[PDB]
UniProtKB/Swiss-Prot annotation, chain A:
Signal peptide: none annotated. It holds the Pfam family Ribosomal_S13_N. GO terms for cellular component: 90S preribosome; cytoplasm; cytosol; cytosolic small ribosomal subunit; nucleolus. Its main location: cytoplasm. Component of the ribosome, a large ribonucleoprotein complex responsible for the synthesis of proteins in the cell. The small ribosomal subunit (SSU) binds messenger RNAs (mRNAs) and translates the encoded message by selecting cognate aminoacyl-transfer RNA (tRNA) molecules. The large subunit (LSU) contains the ribosomal catalytic site termed the peptidyl transferase center (PTC), which catalyzes the formation of peptide bonds, thereby polymerizing the amino acids delivered by tRNAs into a polypeptide chain. This is Small ribosomal subunit protein uS15. The lineage of its organism: Eukaryota, Fungi, Dikarya, Ascomycota, Saccharomycotina. It comes from Saccharomyces cerevisiae (strain ATCC 204508 / S288c) (Baker's yeast). The modification Phosphoserine is found at residue 31. Belongs to the universal ribosomal protein uS15 family. Keywords: Cytoplasm, Isopeptide bond, Phosphoprotein, Ribonucleoprotein, Ribosomal protein, Ubl conjugation. NCBIfam families: PRK08561.1.
Curated annotation (Swiss-Prot), chain B:
There is a cross-link at residue 56 (Glycyl lysine isopeptide (Lys-Gly) (interchain with G-Cter in ubiquitin)). It comes from Saccharomyces cerevisiae (strain ATCC 204508 / S288c). The gene is RPS23A. This is Small ribosomal subunit protein uS12A. Hydroxylation at Pro-64 affects translation termination efficiency. The stereochemistry of the 3,4-dihydroxyproline has not yet been determined. One of its GO terms (cellular component) is ribosome.
Swiss-Prot record, chain C:
HAMAP family: Ribosomal_uS8_A. It comes from Saccharomyces cerevisiae (strain ATCC 204508 / S288c) (Baker's yeast). Keywords: Cytoplasm, Ribonucleoprotein, Ribosomal protein. GO terms for cellular component: cytosol; cytosolic small ribosomal subunit. Gene3D superfamilies: 3.30.1370.30, 3.30.1490.10. InterPro entries: Ribosomal_uS8, Ribosomal_uS8_CS, Ribosomal_uS8_sf. This is Small ribosomal subunit protein uS8A. Pfam families: Ribosomal_S8. Component of the ribosome, a large ribonucleoprotein complex responsible for the synthesis of proteins in the cell. The small ribosomal subunit (SSU) binds messenger RNAs (mRNAs) and translates the encoded message by selecting cognate aminoacyl-transfer RNA (tRNA) molecules. The large subunit (LSU) contains the ribosomal catalytic site termed the peptidyl transferase center (PTC), which catalyzes the formation of peptide bonds, thereby polymerizing the amino acids delivered by tRNAs into a polypeptide chain. Present with 40400 molecules/cell in log phase SD medium. There are 2 genes for uS8 in yeast. Component of the small ribosomal subunit (SSU). Mature yeast ribosomes consist of a small (40S) and a large (60S) subunit. The 40S small subunit contains 1 molecule of ribosomal RNA (18S rRNA) and 33 different proteins (encoded by 57 genes). The large 60S subunit contains 3 rRNA molecules (25S, 5.8S and 5S rRNA) and 46 different proteins (encoded by 81 genes). Belongs to the universal ribosomal protein uS8 family. The keyword Kinase does not apply.
Amino acid sequence: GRMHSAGKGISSSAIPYSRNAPAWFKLSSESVIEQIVKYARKGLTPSQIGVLLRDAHGVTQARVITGNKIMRILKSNGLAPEIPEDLYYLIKKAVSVRKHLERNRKDKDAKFRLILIESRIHRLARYYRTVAVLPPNWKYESATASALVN
Amino acid sequence: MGKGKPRGLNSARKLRVHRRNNRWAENNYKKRLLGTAFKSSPFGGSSHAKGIVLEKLGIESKQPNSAIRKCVRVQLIKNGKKVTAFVPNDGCLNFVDENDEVLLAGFGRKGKAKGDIPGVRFKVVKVSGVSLLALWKEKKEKPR
Amino acid sequence: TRSSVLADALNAINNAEKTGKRQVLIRPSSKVIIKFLQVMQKHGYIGEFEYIDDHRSGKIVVQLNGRLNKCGVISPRFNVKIGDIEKWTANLLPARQFGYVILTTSAGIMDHEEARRKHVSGKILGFVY
RNA sequence: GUAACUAUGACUCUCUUAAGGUAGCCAAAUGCCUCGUCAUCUAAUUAGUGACGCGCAUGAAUGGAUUAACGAGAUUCCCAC
RNA sequence: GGAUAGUGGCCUACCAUGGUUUCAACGGGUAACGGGGAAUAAGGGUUCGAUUCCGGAGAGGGAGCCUGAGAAACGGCUACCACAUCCAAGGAAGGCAGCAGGCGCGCAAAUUACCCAAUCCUAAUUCAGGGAGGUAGUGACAAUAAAUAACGAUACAGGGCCCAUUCGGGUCUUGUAAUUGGAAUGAGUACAAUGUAAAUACCUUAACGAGGAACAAUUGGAGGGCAAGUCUGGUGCCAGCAGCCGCGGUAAUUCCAGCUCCAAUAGCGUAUAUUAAAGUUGUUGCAGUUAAAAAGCUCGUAGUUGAACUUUGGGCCCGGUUGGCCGGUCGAUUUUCCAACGGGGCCUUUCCUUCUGGCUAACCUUGAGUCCUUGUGGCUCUUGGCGAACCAGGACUUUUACUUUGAAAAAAUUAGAGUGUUCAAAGCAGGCGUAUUGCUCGAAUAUAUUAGCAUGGAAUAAUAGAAUAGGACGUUUGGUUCUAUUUUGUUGGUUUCUAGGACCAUCGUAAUGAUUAAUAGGGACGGUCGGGGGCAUCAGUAUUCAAUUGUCAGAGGUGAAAUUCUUGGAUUUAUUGAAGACUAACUACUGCGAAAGCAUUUGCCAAGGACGUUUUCAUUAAUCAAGAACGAAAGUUAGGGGAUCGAAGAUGAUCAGAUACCGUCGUAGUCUUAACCAUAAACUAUGCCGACUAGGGAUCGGGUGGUGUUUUUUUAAUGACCCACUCGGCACCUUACGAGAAAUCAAAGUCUUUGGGUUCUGGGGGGAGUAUGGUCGCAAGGCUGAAACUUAAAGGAAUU
RNA sequence: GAGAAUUUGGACAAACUUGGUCAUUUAGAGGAACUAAAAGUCGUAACAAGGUUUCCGUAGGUGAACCUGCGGAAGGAUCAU
């Protein structure tokens, strides 16, 4: 696979067969949801909170424990970010390369990967427009991503 | 393992357009479609033609053979192109004449040269109405 | 992406039965795959097959008897009519006696022999000799 | 000067001193013969134009060949008048 | 609004700015009228259809118009354009793409015939008219049938058999004979009758009509393909034949002839198109490393394609065909013992949304019960309610493809049923009795796989439904705008009640409720990992030059030399200095990158795969016309720079010449900044994404193990390097069952047992990557890209 | 009441002139080609390490093949430290 290269990596997370909570875990849905929400209050994202809960606590997966996914919980508490994670980070990476491109103008390997980041943002956008997670009339141009990230 | 060509059920457009394009490389198709028979081809894409013989000619055979091929150069009544037709038996150049009328036909090879004869693509079958076979076998005599 | 799952399942079974192996592992395992295997099983081209239910598409482990010679899919599911089944079972199979062309008919996944006895048609899935 | 063939691109020698006019262009405002030859424009053109070039005596900042726009410049033809 | 028979931008006026299109609009071509059909024939197809039927158009070319139900008519009119007539010069008349016929054009097509008798049509209409249409003539366009000889006797042969006593008696048959003799028939010909409108022809027939020379059968062939001569005479690389390979140069099986022989045969060849052949157009079904062909490479719209999952079950009866033990029987047929196939009811949480009337036959029941061998044997019939025999009204249905069956699909054609046109192609006739009044079977059926209409199924494929609930359901209960028949004695009104709409405000009823983590992808995160990228820095000799220094005869460069510099000390030596390139050795069957490419050092800026991951989102994907970014070298602009090396050029050799190969110099040349160009044997000459089929190292990441080495600050906490086993991905390599024409190979395998998705390209060799036209570029050129004509091979791989 | 020529405007619209634009056909003095045909002249470029390995892209030069520079490829005459 790896749509934007010849890479064929199979690095992934083979989630456990057990569709129920780990038998060694206590303080169920109530306490973990509170710890998810207060982490999202601090400003971390579902992709980071799932890590912090897997690392520091015994929350193996969020959806098996609770019956609710992490950003599905944030949308339950109305504490979701404006644009989703996938698009946010890809836009941030397009602004990252483009902010260096204008200084270093012969970086044709940078300009190449900028096109790659940008033409992956557009493929996300078309999806998020179809499924209505983003409003229509939405497109990332340039010098407006500066407004989107900050 | 896809065999190149598309194998969608909704690919009839592509599968037809791809043949429409790639059919041109065929010889018969291309010349039937562009109408080469009706632009080139002294016969204007027809079976026979008629003409008035300008000259008697001695065309030299191609290299492995050696002979004088007793052709006749003839202007086509039909359009006005001047072609060179072969006289198709032993002592028939003496039968045709200069300034006489001649029914031509292809040489049995569809716009190519028959054997050793260079640049002759046609053949005399009749002179002044009576066939170049009957006069040869001494069955019919020329008119007048 | 992999465009079809019956394709690589039937291929995998063929690639194994080429070498005269006695079992295959099919990774994707759809309901359409299982139903095709069931029609193979009925006429006796296949032994038994387990369905391991990994919380996903799951997998199958089929057991062969070395009877199956050819076992293929027709990729684009051509809209076949019972008026022209004979044109398929004359073009795909060894003459007339044995072998079966598999239709995904409205009545369900069947062979040409069964579809004739019912007097029904549908699309084409594949074949087994 | 010789040579396929019928006009010669291979040979050979001697160089006007140093080099032998190359790319280009032309009967050109530069061609004597000359009203050059061929085409074209006309009924008819020593004129005009486009080609041809052993060019009496063309030619590379004594600049050569183009060249849009400009011209009370020299010239030819056409329509209106 | 006008006009029209009428609908309509059909036209007018006034408004708005719309409408078609990469699912190919529009423009161009058609040697294009469409269709029913035709030729070829595994299936799939390809090519054609001017032409017997249907429809459309036109009557030399446009336009106009009257008359009429009907025309923008043309065997009607008017004008103009073209061409044409007669003219007494003032005028007049024209329209064969109706029949016949003539020109012309051509490779290419008939009689200026007879008739309304059939088929029909028209009219005031049984009668008249009809070049519609039929009849004859021309007519090898095609198609059917099938003459050109059959039979014995006489002389030779041969072939099965009695014993092969050498016998052959030849007692049977297969032929050969220029010997022989009678019987046969039309091919012709003609009284006749039939046929016909009249005739001709057929059909049938008086009389005549067969004997090898005739009542005469040809046409193309005999080297191969390809059936058939190594036979005579002639020619002698000529004449010629020869589709193709080839034959002929003095003995030709190929030329021209004779004789034999062959293939088809009243036909046979010839030329040009077309189908099969042709898997050389490939959907079935091609080919692409080297034979022609993977588009330099990545991105990307359209296009094509796109993982899995939602009712599976298990049963609880009845009914259809076909073989079943069989004939259960009179060589025609039904029963069980007993199956297979295809089905409806019924519930297992399963629900076809169900109403108001009509219709409910009906017992879930009894109104008297009881016709009655002791009988839960049987109905004259009907309280309370079934509905599923039964609509016609309600009245809402989250939509398609797909397939089943049916409907109307003109005839002719095609397939095909029946029938002795003498047979057959045909035809739709005929058949059978008293054959005096007769009777009677036929003129079937089938495909027309597009679209539309109904019909049953709901496997495959897509779409939405409940996510800020504006979600679902009701003996909940509240107000609104409603409308609305029935009685209010007569309709009409204010408020009513009552029924039915829809709207919020509440009440409840639910599982007080509500959507899988693809050894598909995106993203985050972790320690890495690279000669990936850019920008700035740091280094190293070397090369050339310069400054100084020491030596005194050469140095260079060669196969050999010569140009070349040198005593004013060249070359060599040393101490420095400068400049611009360049990154040696390490350097590998090793790394990174989309490809091109990328090897000194440090720092900065961004990025990137791989691995790990019980993180996250949840189909966001694959490939991709158009459209884009990067793209060696050379080349072009303009600035720096110019050390080395070196197109051009100078020049020395060699040479027969050598403005080349070798020698010495040497501009442009880029190494650099900005801007172009956009091609390379841009190569792995092998498209990408995906699945499966079978030993060793080595790069990167991770997991274990070693009481291995190092580790000291006390034993080491380790860490690194190393060793063994282990995976994931990488660049590979060595042996081989399948593949390929082979060379060969991890894909070039899973391919006549042919289908995972998808893009690009090729169809003998030349001409030719040429001309032309666009397009881009400062130019050089790049992209796209033909044809005429030419040719029987060109080419790939392996063998000697 | 009928009613002819005549003529007033309207739309339909041929046809005429006048340029335009596209398509097809086609003349042209000259110029620069390409293919064929006997091989006639000049060399000998390629096939062997073809005597300078061959070839590609590009740039320049030259009677002609060709030669040379730069970069690339083995389809190399090396599958090797």
